[PDB]
Amino acid sequence: PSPAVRPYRPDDREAVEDICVRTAHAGRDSRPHYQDPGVFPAAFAAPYVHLEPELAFVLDDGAGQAVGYVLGTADTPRFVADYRAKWLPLVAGRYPEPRHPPRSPDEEIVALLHRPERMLVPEVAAYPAHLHIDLLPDWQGRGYGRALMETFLRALHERGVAAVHLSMVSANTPARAFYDRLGFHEIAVPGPVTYLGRSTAE
Ligand SMILES: [Cl-]
């Protein structure tokens, strides 16, 4: 039994959210730094598998357990609308719409959760799809990030979407090299965030 990329299933939800938590702090574990790290998958993983599970893929460890993922959306403007209309009501009880400016790191992420319009960056308009990709530390440096990425790009291209972007923390230079090796170019660095993109054709 060997590790392999496969489509996400609903029984991968727990593992996907945990991978997200464990990589959300500029690639590193968010648990030491946040009171409720569940806000991360609530903003950056769960809505994708809720709304567009057909674009979610996992790295299976060979024993059935997801140990990495790639997920995303075919169309960012539609995703933002759907996120507000369909997703936010499902999490607003647990994470209420903010009434005052963020006081804590936790409240900063809740602010992002409640502003999916953050995704409407003018410079990425020509790259309609976007993604998040993460692997648990023990699974990095094994070629599996590439396997995930190529699977996701093929899925987008098959759906007729020609271009994709992503965001990354600018200071995270190892991530920058990872994306560079996967054929991404710099779109813009507006903020601690860099946007990268490429065409989805192989
Ligand atoms: Cl990052």
Ligand 1 centroid to residue 30 C-alpha, Å = 12
CB within 8 Å of 201: residues ≥ 6 apart: 157, 162
Decide: 164 and 72 in contact? Cβ < 8 Å.
Answer: yes
Quote the tokens at residue 194. Answer: 């860099």
Dist CA 158 CA 109 (whole Å): 33
Dist CA 104 CA 194 (whole Å): 23
Rounded to a whole number of angstroms, the CA Rg of the chain reads 16
Ligand 1 centroid to residue 108 C-alpha, Å = 16
Decide: 21 and 31 in contact? Cβ < 8 Å.
Answer: yes
Going across the sheet that includes 163-169, the strands are 4-7, 57-60, 66-73, 129-135, 163-169, 193-199, 185-188
Decide: 15 and 8 in contact? Cβ < 8 Å.
Answer: no
Dist CA 154 CA 201 (whole Å): 7
Ligand 1 centroid to residue 192 C-alpha, Å = 10
Decide: 166 and 184 in contact? Cβ < 8 Å.
Answer: yes
Ligand 1 centroid to residue 20 C-alpha, Å = 12
Decide: residue 25, CB within 10 A, 0-12 exposed, 13-18 middle, 19+ buried: middle
E strand or H helix that includes residue 57: strand 57-60
Ligand 1 centroid to residue 168 C-alpha, Å = 4
Task: Give start and end residues of each alpha helix (H) in the chain.
Answer: 13-23, 39-44, 46-51, 76-82, 88-91, 105-113, 144-158, 173-181
Ligand 1 centroid to residue 53 C-alpha, Å = 22
Decide: 182 and 149 in contact? Cβ < 8 Å.
Answer: yes
CB within 8 Å of 6: residues ≥ 6 apart: 57, 58, 60
Q: Please state, as a whole number, how many other Cβ atoms lie within 10 Å of the Cβ of residue 69.
A: 29
Dist CA 80 CA 124 (whole Å): 14
In the chain the first and final C-alpha atoms are separated, in Å, by: 28
Quote the tokens at residue 44. Answer: 């950056």
Ligand 1 centroid to residue 26 C-alpha, Å = 5
Task: Give this entry's resolution in angstroms.
Answer: 1.5
Dist CA 145 CA 178 (whole Å): 8
Residue 197 has phi, psi (to 5 degrees) of -160, 170
Please write down the long-range contacts of 38-41, taking CB distance under 8 Å and 24 or more positions apart.
38/94, 39/95, 39/106, 39/109, 39/110, 39/113, 40/109, 41/16, 41/17
Ramachandran region of residue 160, left (φ > 0), alpha (ψ -120 to 50) or beta? left
Which experimental method was this entry solved with? X-ray
Dist CA 134 CA 131 (whole Å): 10
**What domains can be seen in the chain, in order of their start residue?**
1-202 (3.40.630.30)
